[PDB]
RNA sequence: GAUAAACGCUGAAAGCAUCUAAGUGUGAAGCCCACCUCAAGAUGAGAUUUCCCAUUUCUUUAAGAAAGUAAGACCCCUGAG
RNA sequence: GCACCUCGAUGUCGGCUCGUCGCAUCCUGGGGCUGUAGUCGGUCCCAAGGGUUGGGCUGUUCGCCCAUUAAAGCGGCACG
RNA sequence: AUGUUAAGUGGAAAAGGAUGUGGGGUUGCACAGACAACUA
């Protein structure tokens, strides 16, 4: 799962340390199994994961 | 046992790439073809399974090599005779038969059993600027790492 | 040449220098005194 | 540069003009036949295909003779590639004839050696034997097999085997006479192999 | 540096080109090329040069004291050239010219041929003097220590090839 | 051909001197070729010349099965270089 | 020196046959210094490609001797 | 973020040797002219 997201992270300019970091200072308490799940499936909900952590570590 | 994707044999499209090897050091140019021919890049990734894309190198000839590296680095080789090693090479493969080098560092950073043996197999290493492979509508790759 | 890990000068007109890595004295005075260190 | 493909007939001998005795050997070469030029642009090199030895016509194949037909001959028993030859100089239905070659021209020449068999040591190796006496049990036999440190044995002991049947080069014998109408040039000292046997002659590479 | 810092004044006759890093003096002789670096840069109002230094380079000077001596070298060559003066001790030995053709017979159970390049001739008025003529100051150089080579003096009685001022030393070789 | 010890040429840092840092050479029975032999199972299995060119039912039409053949090869017999 | 190892078994030295590797180099190749005139030498540096002998006396290595040689190297490999 | 190392040191070893480079101090001699180089 961690290699799988750290992939999908990367195409979204993240990568996974700091991916993990903004979505613990936002409260999103998602799986790395259901991450990696949407990062293979739903590409879009993936992008809005990945925008709200980008907002919350831009403060 | 329940819900993670795996991917199949022939599922997962592999991508042709063009990358330029003029002032990278060889190491670091190897590290990031040896990630692309993996397909460490692509969620799609499963271990037991080829998902890696094809990877074209060109101008290997000018390939970087920092400190005394061109003179003090070698190459050895033992043909299992007595006394029969070989220490003949240097930064002399870059000069002469600059592919050996480019393909004995990328080989090093790949896994040592069949599947990785395969993976080597779309690594296309070229001294010059040209390569023959203009069919196959291949993509530019651009390193800063 | 002397070649020891002490290399001095020895005379008025020996210099020391370093060719590589590597000190050596130089006289041109008396053949005798030159020198590398190893 | 000059070559030609012959076979072997025999050893004999010969006095000189100052009057000396020397041994030599008759080397018989019909004319030898051009059949194909291999150039760059098509092969990569440059060499010349050459023929010897008419053979008759049930002995050969229908691919065989589509091979020979451009130069217009009869089927070949034995076919080489001459190297280093500056092309111009030849084309497809050339003969080479002894004439090539005149009297002095140090020479090299290549044939397969003859065949011996399963042989020993001794024979094949030229190792020496273990004592015929004093209490002794080691005649003829192939010597230790190496030290016990690495729990092997090494590569190129030599042992028993296959004897002969390899080729062999040897070099700058003189052409001490050649006879045109008969087709034969004589060579002084002894070449490698049976009587009927292939030979190759070149001029010599050490000039 | 103290030479970095110095004037080169060209002589008449200079003509100085500029592309990029290639300089190109010609003179009345010669038009010889060098290529020089970027960090120390040319100059105008001709009949004179100074060239300059940014700093803050580690050794912060030798890079610009070889920069300018190498062309006030070629200034000094192009309009005035250099020379090397080669003497002949050694009972029987003799130089002989024949255009590029020098030859030489010092003890040896041959003669000895050297040949010179474009730039550069020879001059040998009598049987103990030799002179090497060009241009460069490197290629001169070169070649008179490539002819002195043949034959270095000994220091019994100075026999051999040496240039015309060097300093040898004499030891007493006993009678027997 | 590129080098070891050794020896330079030009040259500054360090107005001089200095084979070295930038540039430029010489130099060993040693190193890579040069000579001889093996080698495409080099699964990265390479190249050139020549020779040979279509019946039957269908699972379904598919790198399908089975049958008789071309070029060529082998079994079997007389042997030896 | 010690006693980890092997006591339901790990057979000692010289010679023979067959060698291989290190270099602290015995010869041959290249060099600097000499209290190196030449011919021979002393010593130090680079160099492991190839070469490095037959007898007498002792079970003998070791050793001494005889006649030669460009030279008659020293170690590891279960003191092969 | 700010520096150091050029030795593949990092990634085995001492007495001793050295104009290798970074930082901090103590001073002799310097425009009533220094050190070096060239005349006499
Ligand atoms: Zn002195």
């Known amino acids: 799962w961690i290699a799988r997201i750290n992939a999908a992270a990367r195409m979204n300019g993240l990568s996974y340390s700091k991916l993990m970091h903004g979505l613990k200072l936002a409260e999103i308490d998602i799986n790395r199994k259901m991450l990696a799940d949407l990062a293979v499936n739903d590409a879009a909900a993936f992008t809005a994961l990945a925008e709200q952590a980008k907002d919350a570590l831009s403060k | 046992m329940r819900t993670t994707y795996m991917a199949k044999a022939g599922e997962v499209e592999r991508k042709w790439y063009v990358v330029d090897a003029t002032d990278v050091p060889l190491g670091r140019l190897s590290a990031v073809v040896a990630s692309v021919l993996r397909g460490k890049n692509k969620p799609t990734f499963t271990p037991h399974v080829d998902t890696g894309d094809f990877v074209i190198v060109i101008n290997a000839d000018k390939v970087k090599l920092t400190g005394k590296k061109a003179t003090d680095k070698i190459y050895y080789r033992h043909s299992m005779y007595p006394g029969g090693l070989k220490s003949v090479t240097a930064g002399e493969l870059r000069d002469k038969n600059s592919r050996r080098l480019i393909e004995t560092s990328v080989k090093g950073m790949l896994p040592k059993n069949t599947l990785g043996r395969k993976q080597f197999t779309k690594l296309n290493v070229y001294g010059g600027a040209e390569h023959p492979h203009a069919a196959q509508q291949p993509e530019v790759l651009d390193i800063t790492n | 040449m002397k070649v020891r890990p002490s290399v001095k000068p020895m005379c008025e007109h020996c210099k020391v220098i370093r060719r590589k890595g590597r000190v050596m004295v130089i006289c041109p005075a008396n053949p005798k005194h030159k020198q590398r260190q190893g | ?207 | 540096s103290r030479i970095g810092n110095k004037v080169v004044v060209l002589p008449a006759g200079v003509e100085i080109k500029q592309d990029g890093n290639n300089i190109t003096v010609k003179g009345p002789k010669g038009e010889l090329t060098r290529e020089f670096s970027s960090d120390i840069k040319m100059n105008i109002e001709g009949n004179e040069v100074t060239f300059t230094r940014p700093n803050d380079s580690k050794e912060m000077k030798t890079i610009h004291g070889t920069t300018r001596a190498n062309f006030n070298n070629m200034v000094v060559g192009v309009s005035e050239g250099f020379q090397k003066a080669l003497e002949l001790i050694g009972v029987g030995y003799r130089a002989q010219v024949q255009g590029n053709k020098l030859t030489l017979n010092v003890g040896y159970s041959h003669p000895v041929e050297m040949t010179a390049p474009e730039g550069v001739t020879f001059e040998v008025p009598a049987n103990t003097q030799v002179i090497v003529k060009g241009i460069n100051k490197e290629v001169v150089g070169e070649l008179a220590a490539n002819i002195r080579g043949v034959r270095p003096p000994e220091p019994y009685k100075g026999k051999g090839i040496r240039y015309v001022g060097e300093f040898v030393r004499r030891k007493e070789g006993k009678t027997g």
């Open chain 4, 1 to 207: 540069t000059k070559g030609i493909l012959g076979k072997k007939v025999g050893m004999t001998q010969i006095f000189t003009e100052s009057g000396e005795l020397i041994p030599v050997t008759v080397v018989e070469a019909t004319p030898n036949v051009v059949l194909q030029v291999k150039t760059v642009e098509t092969d990569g090199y440059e060499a010349i295909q050459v023929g010897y030895q008419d053979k008759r016509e049930v002995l050969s194949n229908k691919p065989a003779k589509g091979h020979v037909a451009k130069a217009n001959t009869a089927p070949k028993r034995f076919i080489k590639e001459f190297k280093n030859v500056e092309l111009g100089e030849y084309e497809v239905g050339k003969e080479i004839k002894v004439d090539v070659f005149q009297a002095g021209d140090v020479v090299d020449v290549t044939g397969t050696t003859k065949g011996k068999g399963f042989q020993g040591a001794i024979k094949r190796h030229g190792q020496s034997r273990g004592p015929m006496s004093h209490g002794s049990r080691y005649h003829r036999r192939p010597g230790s097999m190496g030290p016990v440190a690495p729990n092997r044995v090494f590569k190129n002991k030599r042992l028993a085997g296959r004897m002969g049947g390899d080729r062999v080069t040897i070099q700058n014998l003189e052409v001490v006479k050649v006879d045109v109408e008969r087709n034969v040039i004589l060579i002084k000292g002894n070449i490698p192999g049976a009587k009927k046997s292939l030979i190759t002659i070149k001029s010599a590479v050490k000039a």
